[model samples]
Target chain A: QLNPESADLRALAKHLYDSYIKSFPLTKAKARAILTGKTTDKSPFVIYDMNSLMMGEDKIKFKHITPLQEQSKEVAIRIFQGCQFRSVEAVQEITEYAKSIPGFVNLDLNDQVTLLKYGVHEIIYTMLASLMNKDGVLISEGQGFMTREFLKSLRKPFGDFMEPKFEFAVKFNALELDDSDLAIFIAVIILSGDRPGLLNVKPIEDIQDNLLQALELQLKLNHPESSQLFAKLLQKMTDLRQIVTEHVQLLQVIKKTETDMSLHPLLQEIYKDL
Target chain B: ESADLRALAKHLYDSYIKSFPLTKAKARAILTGKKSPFVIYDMNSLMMGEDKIKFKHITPLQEQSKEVAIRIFQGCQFRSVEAVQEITEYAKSIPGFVNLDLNDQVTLLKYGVHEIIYTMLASLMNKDGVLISEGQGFMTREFLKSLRKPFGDFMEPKFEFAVKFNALELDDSDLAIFIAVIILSGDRPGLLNVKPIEDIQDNLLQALELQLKLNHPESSQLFAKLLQKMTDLRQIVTEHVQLLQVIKKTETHPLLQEIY
Candidate 1:
């Protein structure tokens, strides 16, 4: 959290809040449509055909349908490229958002880059969960939502890779956090001190701690139904880390197997050192 | 062979300088096949019965001016910081590590140090648990779990991983190259140059592969297994960072705050 007292921090928080709203308009309704399979929108990202399929049952049978085929590889690469593109865009937006925080720019440029590289995947999943329902995550800047079964139909790594995130999204969405809570949580991820090579951790840690405190305080007022809600939210941070850890492992596997395929340079740099 | 062994010995000596200063005489005696009175801690015996209550000899008291917990915590932090420094130097001494960008070197060491620390900690462990003060005393899994926040949380996961990792039975030479592999990792996120780092890691892995083939002849896949363990190291350390996050949020230990 940028110092709460700073006008800049407040303005950034509002910017994040507004940006989120602008990005994920009609989240509750969209979530409802995705879950119930009643949406009329002919969105590019939405795939209604696979919505009812269970990932595990479909997966075992699907693999036998086309094992290591050229077509399957092509589809996996395309979807991977799509995911990478989104990650690059998210990293850019989040980086600018982080730079706007009062003292974020004051840190060594390398340190700033380091934090963004490590934290972007985490923040992406957290925010992506915000735009998600039980079916799958929203894509193409909220033009449509993909089905969980569709994602599971891709080739081996690509299909299996996102399952953890979708599983997490279902549980995290169960918490029913609102936009304001998501804004503060995003800022907390941006300002995290756990990145390697921080020039001065205390200042970053202070900002993060303050952000956490502010988020906890906000949650107390926002979700009065359960006092355990905030602690449960904190647990999501660990869950996010676990997901990213697996994501990194998947990236390593991809690196070994897909040497010919070109990844976005920013995404390349983020996974450069595993 | 002589030069390589000397270099390895010198690097180990350098790493040992600022560490916890645990006596090595007992380990040396065991290595040399001499009788030694010192015995390491047993993870099983340290637990006291049906309702396991580990009798902690050095519990911190409320009225005490400086509690034993704080001292032990500080000591761990001190050793951790020094361990980082030591590993950095040791990595630098490796032929290819210093050839990296100054920024890359810092990035590699920063991300890799804790993983190496836990790896080294694993080396010191037996099926029982890690020997805290060489053979003089053992820190039981139960007692270590009883340690206050951050420190306790840190060791518990490492201890668990170590128990599994120790199954590989890696010797000091095997560990040295593995530690190098951990350091020169090209996937630490934020590396300026991946190719050179990966080149170094490739060489280290080739060396380790050859070493494992020669040393552990009966095991056909030890090299592959060790590489897999590196992935396991990342997973455990990621979980450990999650623990650190909670500890950072809930408790404010100055020592942990500084080192972490």
Candidate 2:
């Protein structure tokens, strides 16, 4: 109302539009498929029609989901329904993934979406480490592996576990880590010698890189462990980042071969499976 | 003493800040005072259902009638028992008015409020016969332009507003006499909420503060002029408020028995 063409609003709109174009290409193409139960040669990003989601006012802090505000709720619902998909189904999938992640005990619907937007494995592992250091609600080592298996069962057979599609868990919460110091504690488990199958060098590298970035980005400022873990994680994080960047190429082939983009409904299902 | 003045000012500020509760202090204080009596002024205390006389179609005839020839078809209806008794007493005593139809009474009431506001405004006109006149500095020009920018009306008010606004834009004065008038006279809110005199004072202070921050050429002199003008305007508001209070009291008064 102040000015529809305010620079901030225009910049925000441009960012959203750019993000949509960058993330999804196939569905945005000219030969868009109709809503049928057929597979398409498109990514889930394309099938979702994410560009149609408009962010309303009131949200100023982080670009996407925050626990404090249900700001992204409208955009999330729009993204789901505009693609003619059920929002509840997407929410259920996200919650199930969050529940299955290693060291993840309980999460609200908002937390589930945040984990989805971010990455479930990274946030869960981080929180798990924090819980380990403290006294309350100690999850068992066997339970952690079981949770990972639960997550794998939810995903497609032979899906990319390390480089999972991160929609919510990209951003870091320094404050949450500060209060809990969970990410580092559970991180030691993955970094330890007898790691789980998913907690291979690849997954370890991914976790290490994310942890370093979160620290460097000042996610957990004034935490004593940051500097201590800083030196240990930094080198591993850099190495892992480089390795995963190379391995990410292999996942692209799997994604493309799994589904066709032309069949619209099938494309949605392919993404659903992802 | 200068330091003492600074300390005094600080003390006053602290006291003032405390006047408006910063935290739970005020609430705590009030809560602690549970013994205090709570006085509630209900509608019963209000002097409601006053003798409301409606005057309709009050056209000011310029040619045949006087300079302001207002021909008003009047009507009255009492809502309450006290209202009826009071109005009846006035009607019997007052001459030059006869009983009109019920429809005519409604028209009178509708037009009466409008006419009174306009007439009151007209009566507040300055010595120069201009209701809103320009001041000696850049104030007049800015004030006029501010008015025109918002309303886009070209009445006497608009004309004065424009002239003063233009004069200020042209930098005709070292400082503006009507700086307060220019900024405050703006239709930020309608006439009701804006305490014109208080607004004028605040605007002057605001302009002075801006001048101080900028410290441009002649800013100090401009600020001095503002102080003088604000003092004068404040007195005006006090007088206006007093006058309005008296008028409102008279208007809303209940009738005493038999012209007594």
Candidate 3:
């Protein structure tokens, strides 16, 4: 467990990969194909390509959104609420995935909650990049995806808050990591001891280190020609932290400015405390 | 009722000042008569000596003089940890805090210290920035920005939050209960007995809610706004810790290392 250059770590990583990550078929190619209407999977989800509909040169007739004095703020708030709904659902799914990890349940319940609180948003954004294409992210499940231009059309502050995340998504998707590499990386985020009030720091740090070594091992084998991919992926963790910080600040501003608006209770607790 | 709360608040604030008084050389110098516009640490003269040169400068507040500014920031941060320790002792003096299990007490202190520290820091802040070293020196927003990498950037968000927070102009009475509300937070993940901790927090909140109602009878939402600022402080402390995590990965001052 202590060795950084041991077969035991690799073996553990491989075992975890085969057991947890191997079966997820949501690759970038499949996601792109589905969103592009090439796949006949008949999934219930819809992707809204708001950019082409709103900004396309030879665009079909569409309702133009020009708001009255107070209506513009309402439009921004509505857009943020919709995005919040999607994030809430994503957090639920991510919670189940974390629970399914072998040793995750054995950790202290407090530590478990701590990890989920800090790790959920980062994982959601990471996976959001997975479903993204050159066009924009797939939303409303597979049925429709939102275009980047449509996101920019929202009022001043809302668009400003979202643009950085969209930028991060486009670049991260360019990495083209498979589900296996992502699973181990997500594990690293979950096992980190940097969260406040962790009771068992040393053991948690050891587990995170083990996962990191395994992730490095996989990145080398997966990207034989690209030597810098591992460092790039590590940098994504920091990038995710930055985006999440901004996201939290945006939430704070909205709470202040939109006095009538209320966040979902789960999110309220997460943002308020976690 | 407000008067007693006000007394407790003043006592807590004054105790904080007394416990961790400015020990930094520069801060103490400028704060005291040791070094100022009137006095300076310079001009060691010898017998008819003009070769050795020094002058009594007023320590011009320029970018080139930021090295001195950075030390003041570091000293303030170092004493902040000591201030936190003092606040912890003050927290134990609260009515219900001493009744919690020793483990639970430590757990609450470990997680909740930053929240209380921000509350105290905000109480010391204004539209400009916080005053450090017993109000002897002021650490302005621009000067704080000139410090080294992580430390330079880390406290800006806290200052931003504090400025907006101080805009509420909560009185010392309200601030005292808010600080208690911060420390007795049962929401921290690792509490031994969440029920008891939360019970105490609930009591403090009730007292604070009543105090706000009586003090600011004209505005009904003031109490709600105060509650919202708690979440704001939480967000600020979260960012601060995240920055600390990054700094810890590289090198760190041993004092900061211990405080974290």
Candidate 4:
């Protein structure tokens, strides 16, 4: 039996089309033509096509590129969501561990290749970022740095060996998660730190602990219509974790061969415990 | 039967050239650069005699000033004061033309098109010792000449002056020549005395001066509109300044060196 209650892929697909293609003059016509299969000049992608993509009797065609790569990127982003460093030393330790993975280099190389071939980084980032818990305020607080050394030498070590998947919870309470606009989502996350109904100083003893508060913030703030898309993203992440667990062998192989053992110490420690 | 067709063709051609409808359309189209069938013919053209207009012939000539005069008077007889004012302003600004020679002046004046130019020219021409002591001929000459009984005395010197002198700069000798043309041309019934060109320039500048005054009726409204446009322009300037400020600030974040 189909899981109608579990996922409404049709609405999600239509929403994605509307958000991406409807505003552009040329794309709108192309999208309408794609969705309708009609010989007319209408674009297959329009906001109102939500009803059609969901319930229209006409046939529909859609394609997604590189589902697994998309999955890995989402998982990495999720790690950030769970990060709770009390001090700069803790952050440094986390950074050092992230830098130590052998396969992290390979993954970074692979991600770059995929980004080039797909030409859809914005779409990929949006989807993955949407799935992870909204860091209602701190995401904009501008945490995280990018480094070539991290990409070349450290990514594989940290990502592969220690925390194949690090559990995280961005602690915020009463944070609204409306997905009416990505800006709104970013705004709620950024503004949550210093304002009323903000998340602060929450204890995160375990990385894998369910980020319940973060999830709730996202769900609460989502536009009424966007609630379904958010729900599907959460389900996709849960499905993703299963995909990662199934690939533990690949994780182990990457972990054991990493040149810098300290590069991915968290993955090392976590996998050692596992 | 063949002869009947030829007759029909001739008749149509003649109507096209001579009929008020066809000729006027050509004239108007030449003037305004718009296509309209002769939907509005007037009593004036009928009285003036369609042959006298020969206006369709004027369009193909590349004389812009002459054309401007034609345009001002297309289908309208007797140039109104407002029309004269506009054309005179336009004529004075045209470069390299100190004065139009007889041919050009006649071409322009023929249109009844540039009364303002003619009027200003007339003041420059008014040489009657008592009336308009300025050496230029008056508008009265143009009016009489248009009626076709051009009093040769009134017409000749004025005509000679227009034919001889360049309009580049109306100096004393030129003014004297212009006055001789008017006095030599007969005085009454036909001539139309125009206010002088010099006077016209002074009048227009005076109006502009009044326009700039703070207490003028339209000044506040104009200022408000200008302010609104300036506000919209300032928005872009403000954004640029903000971005420049951001560029100037040195941030110590770890990403700074990477981005730089």
Interface RMSD (C-alpha) of each candidate? 18.8, 29.9, 20.0, 29.6
Fnat for the candidates in order: 0.00, 0.00, 0.00, 0.00
Question: Residue B164 error for model 1, in Å?
Answer: 24
State the lDDT of candidate 4 residue by residue for A110-147, as single tens digits: 34222222212122233223222222111111121122
Ranking by TM-score: 3, 1, 2, 4
How would you encode candidate 1's per-residue C-alpha lDDT over A199-240 as one tens digit per residue? 776687666655665665567667876544554565467678
User: What are the per-residue Cα lDDT tens digits for candidate 3 across B1-260?
Assistant: 65755555555545434443442232324433352222211222111111222111212223322344343434556666667777787777777788899898998888888887877776555445545545443455665565566666766787777766766667665666777777886656678898787676655665666677777886534554565456567768787767767865543234434653
Q: Model 4 compared with the native: what TM-score?
A: 0.17
lDDT by residue for model 4 (B1-260), tens: 44543343333234323311212223323333342222112334322333343333223334323322232222222223334444433333322122534343333333322322232333334232101111111123343334312121323333333322222223321222222122121111232332232233223222222332322353322211211122222233333345435534422113422322
On DockQ, the stronger of 1 and 2 is 1
Error of 2 at A195 (Å): 39
* TM-score per candidate: 0.48, 0.17, 0.48, 0.17
Cα lDDT of all candidates, in order?
Answer: 0.64, 0.28, 0.63, 0.28
Model 1 stretches with alpha carbons more than 4 Å out: A1-16, A19-45, A48-73, B1-260
Q: Which stretches of candidate 3 lie over 4 Å from their true place?
A: A1-11, A18-29, A35-75, B1-260
